[PDB]
């Protein structure tokens, strides 16, 4: 039905388990023809990733700590052992100390702010600038964000400035690389049920509120995000760059409950 | 004649010389009645600040390194020596490596990204959470930003995500402290003639373009910014918090030149 990534290959970052946004995206991209490589943040994740990657015809899995520039250098050296070029990158990496994603934003620690900034924001710049070197004929990349970046979500705390910075960087990178025909966009996802509850202390409440008050009366699925990614990483979105694209079932447009 | 800050006391951060945004602000707030305390970064700045502060009837000058939490604690102990409470805080503190405010954003270094984030963004959180302890009956604070945070200005580079993160944190802090009747807002200033060229490589060109293409055909003055600060820090803006307020002579509204 759709094979618009036939012959294409790319890197998926951020798979932790079968409920990860990065995994939902990977399944859709592979279904459209893409060959996939995966980073993984640790062995316990790597163990879950192996059987998943096999279901998308991949055994290309590379350990990487995105807080460490040398680790990211090594990631791309490993990619190049097999692939001279890349067509796309998916960056779906959200991290902060979850114990600080509770209570007022002002209690955010300097150390958590720095680490959250490096992992949730700057790692996209690090990854993009390495990957662009493998795109001599252009390509496309996405990162993931959330509307809590510039409207206030309780407990989201350190993740908010991080995601706002990430959105800003997405636009600057789109401008840096547009002349090379590399497009750079972000998906601003809504909360995904089950994932949300695991990701932050009030996640279940955030997802429930979002479902009850979105125009479509449902939360976004992993498959919806994957399909939006397929759009943003394929020729279908040839006219689109630097876009913060809401895939949140319309939640963002609602001013107050009906 | 204006005297709406009669009897009020406030902290001014970011005076480096008599062309600093923080200084234009200080002059306006003092003219409206405010008593001022000033932070200063380093001894040469201190020597410049002494005669300036005297012209606004202040000798209340306190050293502070906004990268050093211990130093910020000491700043507030020194304030508490004279003043049980504060009515307002002006945060006009921005820094990035000038060598990296040119060329593509993607060449931003990790260390510069981190330092720019800590100085230009997180220091506002550090300062606000200390200052709120001096505002038992409420008060008002502002920070300074620029529209390059979410629309791409050439060479603005690392400052862009930092300002975007700052704008995000402004809104989160406004929610944290609103229950205490502390209002927190940002002025998104346009470029100021002469300060602009001193601040960034192509600053003169940014200022000239903004002047030629703004609806008002002029650049914002230090006094304009100070008057807007006076609004945002006095009773006049009692209905305003979490606002990113553009004081850029309307430049932001223009889609393309006439």
**Residue A86 to residue A88: CA distance in whole angstroms:** 6
In chain A, what's the furthest Cα-to-Cα distance?
Answer: 55
Instruction: Spell out a b/e string for B204-225, using b for 16 or more CB atoms within 10 Å of the CB, else e.
Output: eebbbebbeebeeeebbebebb
- The interface residues of chain B toward chain A in range 235-254, judged by CB-CB distance below 8 A, are 242
Residue B156 among the catalytic residues: yes
Helix (H) or strand (E) holding B43: helix B43-55
Q: What is the 3-state secondary structure (H, E, C) of B130-172?
A: HHHHHCCCCEEEEEEECHHHCCCCCCCCCHHHHHHHHHHHHHH
Neighbours of A186 (CB within 10 A): 27
Q: Which residue reads 């055909």 in tokens?
A: B217
Burial, B185: exposed, middle or buried (Cβ in 10 Å; 0-12, 13-18, 19+)?
A: buried
Put simply, whether B70 touches A (Cβ < 8 Å) is: no
Taking the C-alpha atoms of residue B57 and residue B55, their distance in angstroms, rounded to an integer, is 5
B120 within 8 A of A120, measured Cβ to Cβ: no
- Picking from B110, B164, B177, the nearest residue to A164 by CB comes out as B164
Tell me the shortest Cα–Cα distance from B58 to chain A, in angstroms.
30
Looking at the structure of chain B, the number of domains it has is: 1
Dihedral Cα A44, A46, A48, A53, nearest 10 deg: 180
Name the residue among B125, B247, B128 with its Cα closest to residue B187. Answer: B247
For chain A, give the secondary structure using H, E and C: CCCCCCCCEEEEECCCCCCCHHHHHHHHHHHCCCEEEEEECCHHHHHHHHHHHHHCCCCCEEECCCCCHHHHHHHHHHHHCCCCCCCEEEECCCCCCHHHCCCCHHHCCHHHHHHHHHHHHHHHHHHHHHHHHHCCCCEEEEEEECHHHCCCCCCCCCHHHHHHHHHHHHHHHHHHHHHHCEEEEEEEECCCCCHHHHHCCCHHHHHHHHHHHCCCCCCCCHHHHHHHHHHHHCHHHCCCCCCEEEECCCHHHCCCCC
Q: What range does the domain containing B249 cover?
A: 1-258
- How was this structure determined? It was done by X-ray
**Looking up tokens 């090594």, which residue turns up?**
A74
Tokens of B113: 């990204």
Mark yes or no for CB contact A172/B160 under 8 Å.
Answer: yes
Under 8 Å CB pairs connecting chains A and B tally to 114
Is A231 assigned a catalytic role?
A: no
Rounded Cα gap, residues B253 and A83, in angstroms: 46
What's the CA gap between A132 and A139, in Å, rounded? 8
- How far apart CA A164 and CA A170 sit, in angstroms, is 10
B115 Cα distance to chain centroid: 17
CB B140 within 8 A of CB B88: yes
**Contact (CB<8Å) B167/A171:** no
**Which position among A40, A105, A106, A146 bears the catalytic label?**
A146
The residue numbers preceding gaps of C to N over 2.5 A in chain A are none
A115 Cβ under 8 Å from any chain B Cβ? no
The enclosing domain of B237 has a CATH number of 3.40.50.720
Helix (H) / strand (E) element for B48: namely helix B43-55
Total residue count of chain B as it appears in this document = 258
**CA–CA distance, A53 with A45 (Å, rounded to integer):** 12
């Amino acid at each position: 039905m759709i094979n618009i990534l036939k012959g294409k290959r790319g890197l998926i970052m951020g798979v932790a388990n079968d409920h990860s946004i990065a995994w939902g995206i990977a399944k859709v991209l592979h279904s459209a023809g893409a060959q996939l490589a995966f980073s993984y943040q640790g062995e316990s994740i790597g163990k879950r990733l192996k059987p998943l990657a096999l279901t998308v015809d991949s055994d290309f899995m590379i350990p990487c700590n995105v807080e460490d520039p040398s680790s990211m250098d090594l990631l791309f050296e490993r990619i190049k052992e097999r692939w001279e070029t890349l067509d796309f990158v998916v960056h779906s990496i959200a991290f902060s100390d979850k114990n600080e994603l509770r209570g007022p934003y002002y209690n955010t620690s300097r150390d958590n702010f720095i680490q959250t900034m490096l992992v949730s924001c700057f790692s996209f710049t690090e990854i993009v600038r390495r990957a662009a070197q493998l795109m001599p004929h252009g390509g496309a990349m996405i990162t993931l964000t959330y509307g809590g970046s510039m409207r206030v979500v309780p407990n989201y705390n350190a993740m908010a400035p991080a995601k706002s910075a990430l959105e800003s960087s997405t636009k600057y990178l789109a401008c840096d690389y547009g002349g090379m025909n590399i497009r750079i966009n972000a998906i601003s996802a809504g909360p995904v049920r089950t994932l949300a509850g695991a990701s932050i202390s009030n996640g279940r409440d955030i997802a429930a509120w979002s479902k009850e008050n979105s125009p479509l009366k449902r939360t976004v699925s992993l498959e919806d995000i994957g399909n939006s990614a397929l759009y943003l990483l394929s020729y279908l979105s040839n006219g689109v760059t630097g876009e913060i694209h809401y895939v949140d079932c319309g939640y963002n447009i609602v001013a107050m409950p009906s």
